Structures are given as C-alpha cells and as structure tokens.
From Swiss-Prot, chain A:
Assembly and binders: Probably forms a homohexamer. Interacts with RVB1 and may form heterododecamers with RVB1. Component of the SWR1 chromatin remodeling complex composed of at least ACT1, ARP4, RVB1, RVB2, ARP6, YAF9, VPS71, VPS72, SWC3, SWC4, SWC5, SWC7 and SWR1, and perhaps BDF1. Component of the chromatin-remodeling INO80 complex, at least composed of ARP4, ARP5, ARP8, RVB1, RVB2, TAF14, NHP10, IES1, IES3, IES4, IES6, ACT1, IES2, IES5 and INO80. Also belongs to the R2TP complex composed of at least RVB1, RVB2, TAH1 and PIH1. Interacts with SPT15/TBP.
Additional information: Present with 3030 molecules/cell in log phase SD medium.
Family: Belongs to the RuvB family.
Cellular localisation: Nucleus, Nucleoplasm
Lineage: superkingdom: Eukaryota
Name this polypeptide is given: RuvB-like protein 2
Swiss-Prot record, chain D:
Function: DNA helicase which participates in several chromatin remodeling complexes, including the SWR1 and the INO80 complexes. The SWR1 complex mediates the ATP-dependent exchange of histone H2A for the H2A variant HZT1 leading to transcriptional regulation of selected genes by chromatin remodeling. The INO80 complex remodels chromatin by shifting nucleosomes. Its ability to induce transcription of some phosphate-responsive genes is modulated by inositol polyphosphates. The INO80 complex is involved in DNA repair by associating to 'Ser-129' phosphorylated H2A histones as a response to DNA damage.
Gene that this sequence comes from: RVB1
Organism encoding this protein: Saccharomyces cerevisiae (strain ATCC 204508 / S288c)
Subunit structure: Probably forms a homohexamer. Interacts with RVB2 and may form heterododecamers with RVB2. Component of the SWR1 chromatin remodeling complex composed of at least ACT1, ARP4, RVB1, RVB2, ARP6, YAF9, VPS71, VPS72, SWC3, SWC4, SWC5, SWC7 and SWR1, and perhaps BDF1. Component of the chromatin-remodeling INO80 complex, at least composed of ARP4, ARP5, ARP8, RVB1, RVB2, TAF14, NHP10, IES1, IES3, IES4, IES6, ACT1, IES2, IES5 and INO80. Component of the R2TP complex composed of at least RVB1, RVB2, TAH1 and PIH1. Interacts with SPT15/TBP and HSP90.
Subcellular location: Nucleus
Source taxon at top rank: Eukaryota
Family: Belongs to the RuvB family.
From Swiss-Prot, chain F:
Organism of derivation: Saccharomyces cerevisiae (strain ATCC 204508 / S288c) (Baker's yeast)
The protein's name: Chromatin-remodeling ATPase INO80
Annotated domain remarks: The DBINO region is involved in binding to DNA.
Role, per record: ATPase component of the INO80 complex which remodels chromatin by shifting nucleosomes and is involved in DNA repair. Its ability to induce transcription of some phosphate-responsive genes is modulated by inositol polyphosphates. The INO80 complex is involved in DNA repair by associating with 'Ser-129' phosphorylated H2A histones as a response to DNA damage.
Residues included from the entire protein: 1003 to 1076 of 1489
Record's subcellular location: Nucleus
Family stated for the protein in its record: Belongs to the SNF2/RAD54 helicase family.
From Swiss-Prot, chain G:
Alphabetized UniProt keyword annotations: Nucleus, Transcription, Transcription regulation
Location within or outside the cell: Nucleus
Its job: Probably involved in transcription regulation via its interaction with the INO80 complex, a chromatin remodeling complex. Also involved in the regulation of telomere length.
GO biological processes: chromatin remodeling; DNA repair; regulation of DNA-templated transcription
Protein name: Chromatin-remodeling complex subunit IES6
UniProt similarity note: Belongs to the IES6 family.
Note from the entry: Present with 1720 molecules/cell in log phase SD medium.
Chief location: nucleus
Keyword Thylakoid: no
Interval of the full protein contained in this chain: 112 to 162 of 166
CC annotations in GO: Ino80 complex; nucleus
Species name: Saccharomyces cerevisiae (strain ATCC 204508 / S288c)
Assembly and interaction partners: Component of the chromatin-remodeling INO80 complex, at least composed of ARP4, ARP5, ARP8, RVB1, RVB2, TAF14, NHP10, IES1, IES3, IES4, IES6, ACT1, IES2, IES5 and INO80.
Taxonomic lineage of the native organism: Eukaryota, Fungi, Dikarya, Ascomycota, Saccharomycotina
Gene name linked to the record: IES6
Amino acid sequence: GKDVPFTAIAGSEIFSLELSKTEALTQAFRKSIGIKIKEETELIEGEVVEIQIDRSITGGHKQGKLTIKTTDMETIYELGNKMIDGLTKEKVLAGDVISIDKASGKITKLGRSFARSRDYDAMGADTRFVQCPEGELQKRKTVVHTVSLHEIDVINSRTQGFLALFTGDTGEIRSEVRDQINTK
Amino acid sequence: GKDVPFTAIAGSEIFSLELSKTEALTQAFRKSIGIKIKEETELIEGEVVEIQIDRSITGGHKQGKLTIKTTDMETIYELGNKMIDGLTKEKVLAGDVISIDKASGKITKLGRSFARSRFVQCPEGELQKRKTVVHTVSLHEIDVINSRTQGFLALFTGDTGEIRSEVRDQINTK
Amino acid sequence: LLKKRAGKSRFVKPRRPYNSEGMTRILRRYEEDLFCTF
Amino acid sequence: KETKEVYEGEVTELTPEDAENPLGGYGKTISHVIVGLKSAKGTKTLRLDPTIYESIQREKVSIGDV
Amino acid sequence: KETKEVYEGEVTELTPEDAENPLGGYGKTISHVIVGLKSAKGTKTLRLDPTIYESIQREKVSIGDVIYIEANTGAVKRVGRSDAYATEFDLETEEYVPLPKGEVHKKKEIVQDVTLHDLDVANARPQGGQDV
Amino acid sequence: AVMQFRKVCNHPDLFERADVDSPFSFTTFGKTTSKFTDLIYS
Amino acid sequence: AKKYCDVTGLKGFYKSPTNNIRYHNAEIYQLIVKPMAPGVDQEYLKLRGAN
Amino acid sequence: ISQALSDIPAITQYNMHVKKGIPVEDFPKTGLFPEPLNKNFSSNISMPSMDRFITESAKLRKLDELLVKLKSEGHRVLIYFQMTKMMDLMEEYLTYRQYNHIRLDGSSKLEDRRDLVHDWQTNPEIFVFLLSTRAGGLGINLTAADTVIFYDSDWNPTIDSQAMDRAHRLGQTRQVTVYRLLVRGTIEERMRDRAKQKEQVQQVV
DNA sequence: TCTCCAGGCACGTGTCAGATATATACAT
DNA sequence: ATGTATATATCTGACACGTGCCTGGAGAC
C-alpha cells in the first residue's frame, strides 16, 4: 500500500565514483525506514481587505500587515518575509479569497468575490466567482507527513541539503550526523 | 631531542588519492630539513594596576591612562585611541597580567595575579624585555607559503595539492 | 482610625510595535492601490 | 501547448501619475501608470499597476524603446 | 567543563549609526549598533561592532524579539518572540517564550562531551567564527 | 534522605536543570574576570 | 618632543605614577626615584619646566 | 565580502539614498547569503526544549493530557502542590498553554490573598490555580471550582481532607470530580498506603 | 552681590536573613 | 527509646531603592 517506503534498486547502482559501496548501501538502508510526524497547522481562509507591504530601498528587508476578513470576523495580521514572497507570487488584488496554511506556508487563491469594476486592463485575469467564506476565520487542523531517515540525514548534513535531495550531492555523510539523527 | 625534525611515516602512508606517490615522498623529504632563524622582539609584560578611559558623548576621541606594574617597577602610560580600542576589546580589568606586543597590538591575558580577597605570579625585572626567539621551520612549510595557489591552511587541512617544482627551486635558492 | 481601616480592609495584551522608517510602502485597497517610493 | 497573452511595441509616452491624496513622508505616491504602445498598424495606451514602475526603473525603459 | 559568556534578553531598541563616507571603498557601511537588552530584573545597553551585527541581522531579529548573544564565538540565536506583546496576530508559525531570568550578562558552566576527531574536524574545516 | 526520593517522582528537572545546547567553542576570546557596555568581537 | 629620563638624561621609557618623573630602566626607579626626598621633585622637574 | 554576505539596515539605506544623493545602482552589493531552511536551522545553538521539559515527567504528561479536554469543557481547575519549586516551574508549563493563572502561597503577602479571592469569585476568565496544602486548603471560599488536582498531596490525609473541604463547599451548582495523579512502583505507593491506613484509622474512630 | 537650578535631605515601599514546625525512617 | 537530618511551610524582621523640594553652590559682574 501507500505510506510505506519501498526502495527497489539493482546491484550495479552501489558502485559509484562519488560514493563508497558502504555509503551507497547505507543510503539504500536508510531510505527504507520511515518517520511519520504529526503536526498542528492552522488554516486561514477569508476575503482579504487591505494589504500593506513595507519593503526597503533594495527590496531585501520586508515587513507588513495583512487585513483579512470573513462574514463574521475581521482580523488583521502581521507578515513575515516568506509570507510576503508568497503574496507577491499569484497576484492578490485586495478582494480575492485566499487560503493560507500556517505550518506549510502555502498560499492558495481560491478566486475573486468582490468583482471589481474599475480595473487596469493589463492582466488576462478570468478568476472564478467564489463566495466569501463564513464562520470561523482560523481553524485548527492536525496533519501527518511521512519522511524517511535518509532525507533527515541529508537535510541535517549541510546548509543546502534540500538541493542535495534532488542533485544527489550527498557525499559520505559523517557518522556523527547519523548517530545524532538516531538519538533525535 | 628538540629543534631537529623527525618525520615518522609508514609504507602505506603515501598511497593517497589527491597526492601522487612522488609528491608525498617529496613532502616527506622536505618535512625533515629545518631552517633555524633567531629573531628579536620587544615585549611588555606586567600586572595592570588601574585602567582609566575617558570618552566624549559621541566617542570621537578617547583618552586613556593605563598604570601597570611589575614586582620591581611601575609606570603610567598614555594610550592612543587604537590601543584603547584594543583594550576594551579583550577586556582587561584591575589585577590582571597581560603581555603587550607594541608593534602588532596583540594583547594576551596570561590570567590574574595573586589577588583574590587563572592564577599566575606577577612578572619580575624590567617591563620592556628584549626577547630573542629561535624560530625553526621546515622547507615544506615555506613551500606552501611561497606557493600562491594555496595558503597556510594546507599545512593543517592537508590540501596542498601537488606543489610544482618551480617554487621549489626558488625556496632552495633563497 | 485611618490606620485601623487600612490594616483591616485595605485584559487585552498590547500589540507588537510596528516600525518602518525609510521603507517603501505598498497599499492594496478595494478601489485603488498605492506605491509610495523614495 | 500554451496560450500567451502578450503586449509589445514601441514606447511613445510613459508617465506614472500621483494619486489624488498623496501620503505624507513619501515622494511620488503613484496610483497607476499610463504607458503608450505603438506597433505596425497599431497604437494603444493603457493603464498599469504601480508596482510595474519599479521594474521599469530596473529595466531602464525610456521613450523610443520597445 | 566549559564556561560561556552569554548576553541575552528582549531587544528593546535597535539604532545603527552610519559612517561618514559609506562609499569610500574601505571600511564598513555603519560604525556601531546600539542594542537595548532587557531581561528579568535587569536592563542593559549594548554598543556593538559591525561584525557581531552582521550575525545578528543574519538571524533577522527585530524589536521585541529575545536574542541570545554567545560571546565566545560571536554566534547569536533568535530565541523567539516575547509574550509580553500580542500572540494571536502572526502568520509566521512563531513560538513565544517569556523573559529570561537573571541579569543580561551571564557566566554559566556547560559540561561538554566531545572526541578528538571532532576537534580535528573543526580545526580542519573552521566554522563558527565571525570572519570571511 | 527524605529530600531525594519524593521529587524524583515529580520532575527530574527539580534536581538538575536542562541547560542550553551549543557546540563547544574552541576559542580563546576576551572573557571577563568579574551608560553602555562595548561588545567587540574578539 | 622626545621623552627623556630626568635622572640620567637618557631615553625615557617609563614615567612613575606616584611623582611624575620619567626614567630609563629599573634600578634608577629602585634607588633614586623611589627613595627620593619630598621637595626634590620640584627642582627635579624645573629643568624641563613640568612643575 | 562582508557587505556582500549581509544587508544594509533600512534606515541606513534611507540615509545613504536621499540624504546623501547616492543612487541605488552605486549601492554595494548586499544579501548574497543563502536563506536557511527553517528558523530552526539558522543557528547551531539549541534552547532547552519545552516539549522535552514536559514529556520527561509522566505526571505532567498526564496532566497536559487531561488539561486540553478540561479547557475544552470550559471549566475551573485547582491544583495543589507540596513542593515550592514545582509550584514555581508550573508557570513555565502554563505560559506554553498561555492560560490565565494565579499563584497563592504563604510566602506571598497577606493583603494579596483577599483581592485574589475576590478576583477568583468575580472574574470568570481565570482557569488555573496554584495552591499550597496548608495555605489555600484551609477555609477559603472556592465555590465556583469543582476539579481539584492533587499532584502530590498525600503526605497527611487530614490536610487532604481540609483541601477537599475548601473547594467542596456549599453553593456549588454542578458535579464535583477529584483527580489524584500518581506513578506506580515507587515510594509513593508505600506513602499512599500509609496515608490510606491513617485514613481508615481516622474513619473507624 | 544677582540669579537659578539641581544635590542632597526626607519619606514611602519590596526583598533576602532568622525562628517554629512537620515528619518519618534510620542509627545509636 | 530517642536524637536527627534535611527538606518543607509560614512568617516576621531589618535593610536598600523611587518620588518631592528647597536652598545654597555655581555662573557672571
């Protein structure tokens, strides 16, 4: 079934010029042992009202406030750097109903509800008429995600290990990392 | 004894992956010949009595008087702003003993003196001592220094990486 | 009597201080948008 | 396969105008940007988002460029 | 048994003073940075170099965040937001920790268990200083 | 002897507290032998 | 101006903090600068006019 | 290199840009240091984990297990301690839950007790109470609370009965449940057996 | 001798040291 | 049978800091 790791390799993949045979077999061993981690996330869905974004002259430092609302609750917030970088992508035009996952950092524009009349005709926007959500603005949710031991080893190995997930540039991770990961 | 190099390598020590066998043997050969240089430097080592530092509102100019003592003599010194900046950095309080390199500004705290109310005795004799230090060094150490492709850290991380011979004739002639 | 009386018988948290000086501002409202630059 | 909506052509007139209520403590509080376009048997001016003017400054766009 | 010099507390003020000629080639953009640290029963004003401030602004600290300046290596740690201010108005999955007990300047004893190979590795590939 | 079999049940941190976790600083810096205080990198 | 030792006319390296006389080495501080009588200082420093 | 590996402060950028005439193109290059994966990965100094603090004591683990449904019920809870430092580190647990709590003991000042009881009896938003056995377990009106948590209050059954009577009083409008947390296979078993035999001796005569 | 303002004097509130008390198992 | 050991828990008890004020020490002639 799903959610269980299954590493299927041939015999010839162990011999590599970047890895020793024991390192390749240790990676093939640690890819097959899974860690299921639970997490407490918060889903925030509402029609946005006022987006204030304060960026410096070079554009590096970013802060600001986010004013979102639903039918029964109006609540302003405070924005981090990744929140503003996610809001700069998938352009919000102050009246599009969005959904934010607090622990995953995912910004999903559900559609437009305000139906703005005066618009600068530069975009090819054909956003769907969704309704303004009602009820509680902030909802608690418990999620579970599955990761395996090799992934946590590569992530804790160096500064940019998440790129080494995909480039495969994980060259002979030390034993101290592996025993500390086992203890953790 | 000391002051004479003694390299102790094994037979399997030269089969490396980043250095060739002749390169490893040349490094092992040049590790075992010493160069002996005697150089003299003035040092100030004594027990600090009291540090007085006055500064303006913005700190544009800082005036400082440092009184310092030995078991034989004591003195008061007027310090410029750079040496004040080198004294608030690596904080020296009363009762501490320090060694001051006047040319380079290297102030090392040797500890605290015998005043409790680490521990190390107050230095004796003259404050300004002329010390002659006999330096010994290997030719392999000067080869990586004179080679510009790698720094002195290759002596410590072992990443010299096939030093050429044209620098070796230069250090031999020098 | 005052000494005997004294000896016998006698919220919402504040928000974080938002601070932005020398910082370009983007406003996004229902009918108009702003880009205050320097 | 993809469908791309594009605008292209020479720049005949480019000016970002200030808002009707300028915010204090800032210079050039832009409400929208008017950029004129010109191509072969085609000429159209258009309104623009004010944040695009920052990329205009980043791109070094003047009158006469495409 | 290693002793550590620790400057920790909630950041109250953050005022950098600029240089006279910031485009002079040599020198830094700023001269010093004034940091006001307040902990339980103590409040200190810190004047820094540029160099510690590079690591401090590498962690993206701000006003109202409690920090942890380890004076041994110059490394700093953003402990989190303070709960003296509001809590329920954040989107940055933040964690909120109360004010650190004791004074701002500290000297604490930490018992460390290392090996000689870790010392050789840390000296072979040096990390944790405030240099290039 | 009463002082040591009762609050081991309650919390192990009542005897020794959990301290900060940091790498061992292999450094000889300027330490203090104890309206602002200068903090310079050393 | 070049600093000079007031005892010997030599090159002065150290100035005593108790009585403000520059001196050259340790032994003039031992048997001249330390056991000197009070009042000898004023015409000791009269030569360079430091009184 | 150091200016490449970090940023200029925003007010410093403002002072260089418009108060000195330096354009943006002639600014030094900044912000080339890569972003870390998390805020946790930004530094190698790890604080003492609050989760590792609470999970290493199983009595606190069971207390936090029941306190979530106790708070979801919309309730009022008293907890009685014997030890003062465990009475001092429970605030560290309660700040994690950001619960409204007050602390009462005999080391506190006497005139704080009267208005503490007053804000207990009028303000309904207060949730958590910390008490000593002989301080708050004697004759104090606690009529709006029913759930009393005995963390380690088994040392003398008379003080436990007095602390029960301090809360189980007249005027209570709902049911009263008393929870008693303990660990098994320890000296607390023999201490509770001695307390039970003293309770039987008191109950017979 | 004219001016004037803040340095020191006066009067409140919190915060670490002694004193009685429980208490129960162990050793003499 | 009794001291005691080592932590409580209350619980006072003597001591150092945060506001007024006024008048005399300092600047100037």
